[PDB]
Structure formats: structure tokens, C-alpha cells
Amino acid sequence: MIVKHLEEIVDTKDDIDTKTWNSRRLLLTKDGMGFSLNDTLIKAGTETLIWYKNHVEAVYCIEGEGEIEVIGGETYPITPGMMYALDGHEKHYLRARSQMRMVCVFNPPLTGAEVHDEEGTYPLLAPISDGSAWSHPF
Ligand SMILES: [Fe+3]
């Protein structure tokens, strides 16, 4: 049996924060389910190029709006209830107009290494600036 809760996972080591996304890992390679499962927030206004050569991924949008553009393929608007699956290891752009909440399934599971290495992803456009600078302790 495995039981977890998103509200425990946030702001912990299984919550991986990147420029363009915040991935809350629900099932890890360690959990032995044969897939990994996460709840990923794609930050508003961002663009990320994605290419998983060594996994297939299912993505189920439960909040927000954006689009996925397949390289050499079509562009599919993302809205709540939209699902895409990269069974062809498609190279694609993932764009978030508003923040998107995505339930994602990877086969085989992603490893902690791969998530922290940001393997398979290339962040291209980060969220608009909130006026902060690294050199402003405040
Ligand atoms: Fe994707």
C-alpha cells in the first residue's frame, strides 16, 4: 500500500521547481509501480521544448489553458479535460497561457536524477518578472 497527499509533497524534495514548471512527484521509481506519476504546474506564460527519447508520457490537463505544438505535426489547444500522449516520442513545444495543472504518467518511471537533470526538457521562455533580482536581499 502507498498513500500520499499533494499537500505534503509541496515545498519538499519531491516538489521539483524549475523555471517553467513545478513538478510534484506522486509515484517515484522507488515506489515500484512500473510508471511514475506527477502533478505538474506549468507556469503561466512559459514555453518549453520537450523531447523524451527514452519514455512515453501521458499528460492530462485538469486546470488552465495553453497549447502543445508537435514539431513536424499539429498544434493542439490544451484546456481542462484535454489529454495527450507522446507514444511516438514526439518533439514538442508546451506553452502555458494561464498556469496549467497537468497529471503526468511516465513509462518507464522517471528517476530523481532525470527530473533534477531536466533531461528531455529545454526551457525557452520563463514567466514575466516579478521585479526581483538575485542581488536584492530586500
Ligand atoms: Fe509533455
Author numbering: 1 to 138
Wording from the paper:
While the EctA and EctB enzymes have amino acid sequence-related counterparts in various biochemical pathways in microorganisms, the ectoine synthase (EctC) is considered the diagnostic enzyme for ectoine production. Crystallographic analysis of the psychrophilic S. alaskensis EctC protein [(Sa)EctC] showed that ectoine synthase is a member of the cupin superfamily. By using an ectoine synthase from the thermo-tolerant bacterium P. lautus, we were able to obtain high-resolution crystal structures of the full-length EctC enzyme in complex with its iron-cofactor, its substrate, and its product. The (Pl)EctC protein is a head-to-tail dimer where backbone interactions between two ß-sheets mediate the contacts between the monomers in the dimer assembly.
Since the ectoine synthase is an iron dependent enzyme, we added Fe(II)Cl2 to the crystallization solution of the purified (Pl)EctC protein to a final concentration of 4 mM and pre-incubated this mixture for at least 30 minutes prior to crystallization trials. Without this pre-incubation in the presence of iron, no crystals with a quality suitable for X-ray analysis could be grown. This approach yielded crystals which diffracted to a maximum of 1.6 Å for the (Pl)EctC::Fe protein complex. Since the monomers of the three (Pl)EctC crystal structures are nearly identical in overall shape, we only describe in the following section the overall structure for the high-resolution (1.6 Å) (Pl)EctC::Fe complex in detail. The structure of the (Pl)EctC protein consists of 11 β-strands (βI-βXI) and two α-helices (α-a and α-b). Since the asymmetric unit of the (Pl)EctC crystal revealed only a monomer, we inspected the crystal packing and analyzed the respective monomer/monomer interactions to elucidate the functional dimer within the crystal structure. The data resulting from this analysis show that the (Pl)EctC dimer in the crystal is composed of two monomers arranged in a head-to-tail orientation; it is stabilized via strong interactions mediated by the N-terminus (sequence 1MIVKH5) from monomer A and β-strand βVIII from monomer B (sequence 81GMMYAL86). Clear electron density was visible in the 1.6 Å (Pl)EctC crystal structure for an atom with a strong electron density, which cannot be accounted for by a water molecule. Only when we refined the (Pl)EctC structure modeled with Fe2+, we observed neither negative nor positive differences in electron density, indicating that iron is indeed the most probable element present in the crystallized (Pl)EctC protein. Within the (Pl)EctC::Fe crystal structure, the iron atom is tetrahedrally ligated via interactions with the side chains of Glu-57, Tyr-84, and His-92. A water molecule completes the tetrahedral arrangement of the (Pl)EctC iron-binding site in the substrate-free (Pl)EctC::Fe crystal structure; it is present at a distance of 2.9 Å relative to that of the iron atom.
